[PDB]
Design a protein around this ligand. Structure first.
Ligand SMILES: CCNC(=S)N/N=C/c1cc(O)ccc1O
Ligand SMILES: [Cl-]
Ligand SMILES: [Cl-]
Ligand SMILES: [Cl-]
Ligand SMILES: [Zn+2]
Length: 315
């Protein structure tokens, strides 16, 4: 007896492609690698309950290649498999609302993803890939499973891997519209003189070396090629936020002097992030957990500040 069902294949879960599948054969034999809401059904034969359902496949014809690139803005061949594999886990995570923001209950070392997600909801940022636009919209509303899986895929992290918040934000920033952002810096060595530099996009909003936006404006000491120590300070800044980062060190966060920050406790190969946000008071969101304090001191590695336009006074 020949037995078939109709299903739909997709790469973006919007554009559907009608298929007829033979119930005596696996999905793999008919589509190649096949997924049902994240689950790998490649080695599985069609079930009656599969009729009418949407299955993800890999882009193995030109029409799917174009749909996938337009939706995700990547042509990494392993992207979709990595996204599905992550999603099969992130759809089981919980996404509690904590002080008005979508967080993530701790699981699978995802603390770095929680503080990244919490941070995104406090800074002005638009993603370019439609996949991130759509998934971020849902994540804000509370259904963050697809967004978290996409973050993992874009950053080439698997569920359970330890992540770095700064690196994760770098990847997300690459897929955001920061074209308007501009940074002008000046480096002063007393043996070589001055030298001014201009940064754009992602490099205009990220700095590594100090957590303090004010100290960045006043000046910070760095090496120079002659062996002398030079001073770098901020000449001009155009962006809706800035991100200051440093290796984790004890730091004091004051209410109303910053938007949010990331705290890291542990070592290089093992640790835990928490999120601090400055609202009517200082709230520490640790996944599903919430505490408050008027003052805060702890090992801070990233601090986020609001900005529109800043011009320096140093002549
Ligand atoms: C450079 C050769 N590939 C082309 S033009 N399409 N591939 C697209 C594509 C492939 C993936 O694995 C994931 C997402 C995608 O958008
Ligand atoms: Cl089966
Ligand atoms: Cl899991
Ligand atoms: Cl967006
Ligand atoms: Zn010099």
């Amino acid at each position: 007896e020949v037995r078939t069902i109709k299903v739909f294949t997709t790469v973006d879960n919007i554009n559907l492609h009608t298929q007829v599948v033979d119930m005596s054969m696996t999905y793999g034999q008919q589509f190649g690698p096949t997924y049902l809401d994240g689950a790998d059904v490649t080695k599985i034969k069609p079930h009656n309950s599969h009729e009418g359902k949407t299955f993800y496949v890999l882009p193995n014809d030109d029409t799917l290649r174009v749909e996938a690139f337009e939706y995700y803005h990547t042509t990494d061949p392993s992207f979709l498999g990595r996204y599905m594999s992550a999603l099969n886990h992130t759809k089981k995570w919980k996404y509690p609302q904590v002080n008005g923001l979508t967080s993530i209950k701790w699981a699978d070392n995802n603390c770095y993803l929680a503080t990244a997600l919490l941070t995104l909801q406090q800074i002005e940022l638009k993603f370019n890939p439609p996949a991130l636009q759509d998934a971020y919209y849902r994540a804000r509303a509370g259904e963050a499973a697809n967004f978290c899986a996409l973050i993992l895929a874009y950053c080439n992290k698997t569920v359970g891997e330890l992540g770095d918040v700064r690196e994760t934000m770098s990847y997300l920033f690459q897929h955001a519209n920061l074209d308007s952002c501009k940074r002008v810096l000046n480096v002063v060595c007393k043996t070589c003189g001055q030298q001014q530099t201009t940064l754009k996009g992602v490099e205009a909003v990220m700095y590594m070396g100090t957590l303090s936006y004010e100290q960045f404006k006043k000046g910070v000491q760095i090496p120079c090629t002659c062996g002398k120590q030079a001073t770098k300070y901020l000449v001009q800044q155009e962006s809706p936020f800035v991100m200051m980062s440093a290796p984790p060190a004890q730091y004091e966060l004051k209410h109303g002097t910053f938007t949010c920050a990331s705290e890291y406790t542990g070592n290089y190969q093992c640790g835990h992030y928490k999120h601090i946000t400055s609202k009517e008071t200082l709230y520490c969101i640790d996944g599903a957990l919430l505490t408050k304090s008027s003052e805060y001191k702890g090992p801070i590695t990233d601090v986020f500040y609001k900005e529109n336009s800043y011009t320096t006074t140093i002549k």
